[PDB]
Amino acid sequence: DGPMLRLEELGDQRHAPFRHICRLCYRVLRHSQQDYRKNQEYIAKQFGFMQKQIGYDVLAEDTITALLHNNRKLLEKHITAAEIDTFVSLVRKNREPRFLDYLSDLCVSMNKSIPVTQELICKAVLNPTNADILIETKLVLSRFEEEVWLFWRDSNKEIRSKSVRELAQDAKEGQKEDRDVLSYYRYQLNLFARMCLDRQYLAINEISGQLDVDLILRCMSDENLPYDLRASFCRLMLHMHVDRDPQEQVTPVKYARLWSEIPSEIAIDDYDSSGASKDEIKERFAQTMEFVEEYLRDVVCQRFPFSDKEKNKLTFEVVNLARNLIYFGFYNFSDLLRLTKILLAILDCVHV
């Protein structure tokens, strides 16, 4: 401990079992601060002191995230812009993806979002990223076999060229660099699924300039990618594309109609002819509507429709996407029954 002690080879640490014993300290420290306000305020006084130890792989980041997760009054004031900038800077030198989830979980609490927390993070994510952080998006189509390419820049001032499917295939081969690339890619998709919540336009407009419905759906028609990636693509697609102006929740039952407008005969063929304006909107997700249908075809034939855990993880966000689409008035009454029979087929196969 001359200047300090480093967990790396610079200074002796005697890691592995000793760290296993040490992590109990912060584990029981988190146990103490569960659902107890006074402990939170008592630990809050060390807010400045606890800043430095973050990033030393000593579970200090876990402790600070646990403390900041369940105290909104503490979070709204103690967390500052410089702290977020330091968080961002730590990852670049760390060259590790797992740090990314902690920043994302800051803005989400009690299944809602804090506006000031999202505002202080949107610019702090978009501005430092572009220098060299990795970006890991570079959404350009092969036309712009159609494919998208994941060109990421490392710290060695070098441009890596690789198709998404090829690097995904190499990830299961045993390549650690591509595994970390996919980890950071899924993490940044998860981030991108958070700043766009509950109609805040400090980041939605910027994101929509690169992402498109067909661009994201290109990640829906390929099964080569691991299903966690597609899980991220579905949720970000829902959060940014679906919830935006001008589309809004529709009323199911109408209490006031016009006599002359209603024809003498009403049938399914003319169920909802009052959606002429939204015809383009339906068109730009009509293919998405189709994939929602045949995705259920892909799973009906299974003897156990919930066999694989990764397939289970794939299922939930697609369920959510359709769940939101149906209330957004996207499906005509003819399509509701078509979805209903395939939906009930899964429940029938559940008994097997």
Instruction: List Cβ neighbours of 28 (8 Å cut-off, separation of 6 or more).
Output: none
Tokens of 185: 């890619």
Contact 260, 246 (CB under 8 A): no
DSSP state of 159: B
- Token pair 């030198």 is found at 93
Query: How many CA atoms, within 13 angstroms, populate the side-chain half-sphere of residue 82?
Result: 4
* Residues 128-133: contacts with CB under 8 Å, at least 24 apart: 128/85, 128/88, 128/89, 132/92, 133/88, 133/91, 133/92
DSSP state of 141: B
Sign of the four-CA dihedral 151, 85, 238, 273 = negative
DSSP labels, 205-228: HHHHTT--HHHHHTTTS--SS-HH
Tokens of 12: 């002796």
Angstrom distance (rounded) from CA 197 to CA 226 = 25
Which residues on neighbouring strands pair with residue 112, listed in sequence order?
109
User: In 3D, which of 92, 89, 84 has the Cα closest to residue 117?
Assistant: 84
Tokens of 151: 């060109």
Distances (CA, A) of 335 to 113, 213, 269, 276, 317: 34, 21, 11, 17, 20
CB count within 10 Å of CB 272 equals 11
For strands 112-113 and 108-109, give the pairing: antiparallel
Q: SS3 of 109, please? A: strand
Helix H or strand E segment including 112? strand 112-113
User: Which resolution in angstroms does this entry have?
Assistant: 3.5
37 is in an annotated binding site: yes
6 is in an annotated binding site: no
Cis peptide before 246 (omega within 30 of 0): yes
- Token pair 């097997």 is found at 352
230 is in an annotated binding site: no
